[PDB]
């Protein structure tokens, strides 16, 4: 019955099952959580573990005794649960200092700030095992022209990067960093946008190998893009350290409903894709139980982020494994897809006249590609239809 253990690797924000339903037209509906029953009730779940801001287990401006008492009490839930806590991630976008960015801000006093407020959670991450540290600049950007050189901006933001980078490699870190795009909100347009360029900027900091994405469903999907093939150009790269996992409703706000929720074949691409790629790290919910949603709905809500998950991989597996698709796929040349254009060298192609010259271009016009069976086959096997 789809029933989700710690070895799916399902993980959970405090800020997600902890959302108080505050947007931009409405005041909170839910009361605060601890974080440590938020840490029980997961793993009463089956989840495997917990993700967290600095702010969310510390409330800003915490005192060295209090924030050392916050720290104590999480410890002893994981202690007690058995929950994990893989990736961690710094608030630079929710107090007024960062109206206009942390590490692009215009003032240079709130850059030098914000490193300092990253650096400091990092290592509190590392005490806690977080094997990964998520940055989303949600607040990188702009409403207007003249506010922000992008230029300028970018150049900031490989600095402070590469800083980090460099304070990890100081410390002797294993942790690695993962950069999740958003194309917009809260700024008009946030820097970075998509997989794509979070993935390009990556090639131009100091020591790639330390950074990765985090990519979100929603936030591709917030530029109408297809998340299964920013995934796969992620993996193509060996880039995919971390995966926030939702589900929205087309180009709009960003949402967070649970996953499965939204585009449903998007998702079952993406499953399909994680689970055929051998993709290892944490299967991470991004996501909000609707303000609507008493604690019963935000617990459900959440139980069905990863029954989702574990119904898709269920068909995604079916898929793959049917004789009748594996025939399918033959037939829409997925095989030759895989092979080589020309393993046999450029000079060997140029010479080639079966390329070129005598080429029958349209006895291979005619050749159907087969792929609307393929995919009514995938249809079928998705909902369960075989």
């Known amino acids: 019955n789809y029933q989700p253990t710690p070895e799916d690797r399902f993980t959970f924000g405090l800020w997600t099952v902890g959302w108080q339903g505050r947007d931009p037209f409405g005041d909170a509906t839910r009361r605060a959580l601890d974080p440590v029953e938020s840490v029980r009730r997961l793993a009463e779940l089956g989840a495997h573990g917990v993700t967290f801001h600095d702010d969310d287990l510390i409330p800003f401006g915490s005192s060295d005794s209090e924030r050392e008492e916050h720290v104590k009490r999480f410890r002893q839930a994981l202690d007690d649960t058995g929950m994990k806590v893989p990736m961690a991630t710094t608030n ?3 107090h007024p200092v960062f109206k206009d960015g942390g590490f692009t801000a215009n003032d240079r006093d709130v850059r030098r700030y914000a490193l ?3 650096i400091r959670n990092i290592d509190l991450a590392v005490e806690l095992g977080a094997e990964t540290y998520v940055a989303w600049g949600g607040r ?12 300028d901006a970018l150049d900031r933001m490989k600095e402070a990067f590469d800083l980090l980078g460099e304070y990890v490699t100081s410390q002797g870190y294993d942790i690695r960093f993962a950069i999740e795009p958003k194309p917009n909100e809260p700024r008009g347009d946030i820097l970075l946008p ?3 360029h979070a993935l390009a900027f990556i090639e131009r900091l100091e020591r790639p190998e330390l950074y990765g994405v985090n990519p979100e469903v929603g936030h591709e999907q917030m530029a109408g893009l297809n998340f ?15 995966i926030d996992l939702n589900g929205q409703n087309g180009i709009k706000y960003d949402q967070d ?7 449903l074949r998007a998702a079952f691409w993406l499953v399909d894709l994680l689970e055929s790629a051998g993709y290892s790290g944490p299967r991470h919910f991004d996501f909000k139980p609707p303000r609507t949603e008493d604690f019963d709905g935000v617990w459900a809500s959440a139980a ?9 991989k269920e ?38 006249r079966s390329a070129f010259e005598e080429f029958d271009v349209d006895a291979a016009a005619a050749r159907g590609m087969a792929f609307e069976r393929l995919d009514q086959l995938a249809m079928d096997h998705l909902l369960g239809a075989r």
């Not at 409903?257 to 585009?263: I, M, N, S, V, W």
């Not at 069905?304 to 898709?312: E, F, H, P």
């Not at 494994?321 to 393993?343: G, I, K, N």
């Open 194 to 196: 998509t997989v794509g």
């Open 92 to 94: 630079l976008f929710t």
């Open 304 to 312: 069905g982020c990863m029954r989702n998950y574990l119904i898709l």
């Open 116 to 118: 300092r407020k990253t």
């Open 257 to 263: 409903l649970r996953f499965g929720a939204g585009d």
């Open 228 to 242: 299964p093939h920013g995934i796969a150009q992620a993996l193509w790269a060996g880039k995919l350290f971390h």
């Open 140 to 151: 990188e950007g702009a409403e207007s022209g003249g506010a922000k050189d992008v230029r």
């Open 315 to 352: 068909r995604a597996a079916a898929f793959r494994a049917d004789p009748e698709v594996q025939e399918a796929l033959r037939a829409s040349r997925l095989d030759e897809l895989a092979r080589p254009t020309a393993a046999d060298g450029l000079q060997a192609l140029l010479d080639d």
